Amino acid sequence: QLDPITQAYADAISSRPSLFAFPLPEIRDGYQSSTEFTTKILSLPVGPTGNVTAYLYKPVSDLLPVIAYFHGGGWVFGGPKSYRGLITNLIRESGAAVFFVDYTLTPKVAYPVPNEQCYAAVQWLLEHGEKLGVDPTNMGFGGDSAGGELSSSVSLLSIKRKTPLPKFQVLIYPATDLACESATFKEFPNGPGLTTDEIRFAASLFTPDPKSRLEDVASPGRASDEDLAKFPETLIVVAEVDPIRQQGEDFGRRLQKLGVRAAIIRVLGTIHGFASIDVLSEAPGAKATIELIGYKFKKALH
Template sequence: MPLDPGAQRVLDLIRSFGRPPLHELTPAEARAGNVAARPLLQPDPPDVAMVAELACPGPAGPVRLRHYRGRGTADGAVLPCLLYLHGGGWVIGDLDSHDQICRSLANHLGAAVIAVDYRLAPEARFPAAVEDAVAALQFVASEAARLAIDPARIAVGGDSAGGNLAAVLALMGRDGTVPAPGFQMLLYPATDMVGNTPSTQRFTEGYPLTAAGMRWFIDHYAPDRAQRMDWRASPLRAASLAGTPPAFVMTCGHDPLLDEGIAYARRLDEEGVAVTHLHVADQMHAYLGMGRLVPAADLTLRQAAAALRLHWRLD
């Protein structure tokens, strides 16, 4: 499937800048490049009913959170909540990198979204991001009344590395080690740090995420190869996915993570988990953060939100 014209414009823009590929940069350089690209790629953040900065206790100190309430929601109304983990390969990204995505989801859901600023590698390696995600979920569940959140309708979600963390939280909730989320929203998720799939071999250059770029991320986050087999790093390697909550899984065609995302959606289905799998054949990894040039980004966010609204019986 040919690449979407908007996504192709992004690739042309990247080439015009002549930047080295991700795997040739230091983490600091990669983060600076991500910040510089945001105004060029992201649309203006939409207004929401409320944005509030929060923090919760974490294993290495406070974990920053950002609480959004969708436009049109009543002040003080008890809302369902999506706990959102940002993408960026466990190395890049923060509350600001995904502010526009979280605002859009809050509005499309007509609900609350709480974003998590988990620790990044290589300064904090696996399982630091998992530990901070756990702390955030425990906080939202325990403080639901104060936050005007319905504790019976808490979902987890995220894109790429954030989808990885959301899948892990869903497994932990199934096992009773964290409050059990009721839904998992996995957007082009990373699910396996070990496998060498055909899609990994196919996307080797010219894209925002390539096979070499993914290896760069994994080497920073989980340099110990034995840890990569841990299901908290590679949820596709969990012995069973049965009993995890209903899922929305999105994959895209021009993405080295394509095959592992498809494999995760297939396993969920085969093991009795209700799953909606959306495959966007003409898009590339990370396009959800490129809505200024890729209008389909907002359509996908609307589709993900619609699946969650249906689960929450908001429609």
């Protein structure tokens, strides 16, 4: 069922204790190990905590299109280092700038603070982007896993507050419903790459109050028909062997029914994380869909 490269990776980490457990490391972001880009480090004096860290990445040589990217890692891990591979791929394929939001990780904060940090950073980009050489009117959203929850959350908050939506949104195996368990939870309870236990752990740090999980801002899969019908055109990519697979597909079908242009693609033989884990990302299906994502940002953002 799994392709050899993905199977080899799964075998190599079956031996590893899960990192989603106490005590948490104090380093939450690190490198996993040809396209060049510039980096501007931004401390934005905005949002619930008074600061949001953002990195603006631009390809080398009028206004560049820009992808606001919200990284995954279960709201506990990740940052510019661990996502360097995906950011590079996005920049190589899309030709766009990447606005990478380095929001505060759990449990230093909890829902809805990372959501509002991401939302506030986007509002800043909208106002000041032109001065950094990007075109805020040509904006994409991207997010993977927990970042997919954040991407769709920020979209929903934009709809609620009547602030600009991106032209195009990509959700990669997104978490869309933190409250309910879906069919694939049962099908792949610890099926490699992501286990039901890791999911519960991440959800307990990000939304310690289970009642929070029912809110549409936490779980955009539970948003109203009226709000979701206003979503930007969206591409959803899911891994086949993945407890969280059902959430993305159901969310996409829901967008389709409501008249949003939404494409949904299932990649066979791969697992959660294939877009950001270097080893997984070189397998045929993963590699193909990663360049599709970048290619589709290139086509949508002009």
